[PDB]
Amino acid sequence: RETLQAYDYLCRVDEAKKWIEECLGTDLGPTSTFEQSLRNGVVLALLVQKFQPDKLIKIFYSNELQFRHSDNINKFLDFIHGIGLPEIFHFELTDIYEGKNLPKVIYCIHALSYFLSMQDLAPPLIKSDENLSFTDEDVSIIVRRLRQSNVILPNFKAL
Numbered sequence: 001r002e003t004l005q006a007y008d009y010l011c012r013v014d015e016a017k018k019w020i021e022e023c024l025g026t027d028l029g030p031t032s033t034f035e036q037s038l039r040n041g042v043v044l045a046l047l048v049q050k051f052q053p054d055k056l057i058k059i060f061y062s063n064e065l066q067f068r069h070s071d072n073i074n075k076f077l078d079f080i081h082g083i084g085l086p087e088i089f090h091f092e093l094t095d096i097y098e099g100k101n102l103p104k105v106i107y108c109i110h111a112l113s114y115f116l117s118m119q120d121l122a123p124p125l126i127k128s129d130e131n132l133s134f135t136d137e138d139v140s141i142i143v144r145r146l147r148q149s150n151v152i153l154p155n156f157k158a159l
């Protein structure tokens with residue numbers, strides 16, 4: 001069933017969101033729109049900054065003029081490649097910039113969080129509460145997205 005699959009994925013997104021919220025110490029909006037909110041690269045770039053306090057990272061989020069998403073996105077990619085993590089754990093610019101594989105981005109955040117907490121450089125990702133749920137609207141939206149793509153959801157369990 002697509003609904004059950006949608007339910008599963010929404011919990012993974014919620015877990016990734018909560019982990020970064022805890023890391024950035026800030027509120028990051030609804031889970032149903034979290035993936036889309038990552039496309040401009042700001043949040044991921046802030047994650048980098050946090051782990052590289054000795055480096056100044058120019059992050060762009062101007063509301064007066066359009067900024068280059070890839071600039072913030074490449075900051076995150078350089079970081080996950082720079083710490084030597086396997087390519088299988090990452091995502092590509094297109095996946096997030098064009099939103100062609102947002103779940104991969106979420107999987108990437110899960111992977112990163114595991115490696116980092118494992119090296120205890122950060123608190124661990126936390127499995128969603130068992131009673132954690134979402135509105136049918138949010139779930140149906142996920143189902144529609146799955147019906148519009150050929151994307152296959154990543155293997156979170158194996159993490």
Ligand SMILES: [Hg+2]
Pocket residue numbers: 007008009010011128
């Ligand atoms: Hg779930």
Ligand SMILES: [Hg+2]
Pocket residue numbers: 019020021022023024122123124
């Ligand atoms: Hg965290």
Ligand SMILES: [Hg+2]
Pocket residue numbers: 040066067
């Ligand atoms: Hg933008």
Ligand SMILES: [Hg+2]
Pocket residue numbers: 080085089090091107108109111112
């Ligand atoms: Hg990653």
